[PDB]
Design a protein around this ligand. Structure first.
Ligand code: SAH
Length: 241
């Protein structure tokens, strides 16, 4: 059994469950867990438990295959319905993007922890999208479709707790991400916002204390321009000064 981080990393990445995960994520979690000074066996188990939570319930290999099939048939809505977070968004999708884009439709969007949401941006006619996430299966769904459509979408397999997004754009989307980052590393959510090379951002939280947390913690160089509940998301439009 794995008795060090390197061997544990190899083991986890070889598993059917975790093979599509960003290797940096696996190493980050293993290294943090190793620092708790438990046995190698307990440490690897603790790491797997965390990775299970990080992978979550958003997609499966079969749902990803079905999303690809949907895209091949031109059924973008069906593909969107096959990631749990976009499925939640479906009913009010155009209301949401109408709200975000009311003043201006951006040329280039950075979609941070993108899930399958870039497919919605395609349908909104966004010219250029860069999305990052830690599950390569997401890129494996979106990228072949983007190439078929001559659409300027790029996917990065990137853990934002390992390295900040380096790209630049007109608008960053940070949907349903800040809470999970904060739970995992205190202070990381606002640090992510401070790192983004966009003049404006749209940040969302699940909703029917996130509002209080966000409004109380948003660094002074940002201004909240609007705030609205649309479907089961609370959305803030912010500008960086
Ligand atoms: N450290 C990390 N770096 C990058 N992405 C991460 C991450 N931890 C979790 N994620 C990703 O965060 C996403 C949360 S679900 C939200 C997906 C998308 N933003 C949407 O709203 O539709 C998942 O796709 C998950 O894989």
């Amino acid at each position: 059994y794995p008795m060090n981080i390197n061997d544990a990393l190899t083991s986890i990445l070889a598993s059917k469950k975790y093979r599509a995960l960003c290797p940096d994520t696996v190493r980050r979690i293993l290294t943090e867990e190793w620092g708790r000074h438990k046995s190698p066996k307990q440490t690897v188990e603790a790491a797997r438990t965390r990775l299970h939570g990080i992978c979550g319930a958003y997609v499966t290999p079969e749902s990803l295959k079905a999303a690809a099939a949907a895209l091949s048939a031109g059924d973008v809505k069906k593909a969107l319905s096959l990631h749990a977070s976009t499925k939640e968004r479906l009913a009010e999708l155009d209301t949401l993007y109408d709200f975000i884009f009311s003043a201006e439709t951006p040329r280039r969007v950075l979609d941070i922890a993108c899930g399958l949401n870039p497919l919605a941006l395609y349908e909104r006619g966004i010219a250029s999208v860069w999305g990052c996430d830690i599950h390569q299966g997401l890129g494996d769904v979106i990228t072949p479709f983007a190439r078929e459509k001559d659409w300027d979408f790029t996917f990065a397999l990137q853990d934002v707790l390992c390295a900040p997004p380096a790209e630049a754009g007109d608008l960053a989307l940070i949907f349903k991400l800040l809470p999970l980052l904060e739970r995992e590393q205190a202070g990381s959510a606002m640090a992510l916002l401070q790192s983004l090379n966009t003049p404006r951002m749209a940040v969302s939280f699940p909703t029917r204390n996130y509002a209080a947390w966000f409004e109380g913690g948003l660094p002074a160089e940002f201004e909240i321009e609007d705030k609205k509940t649309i479907g089961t998301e609370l959305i803030y439009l912010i500008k960086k000064n």
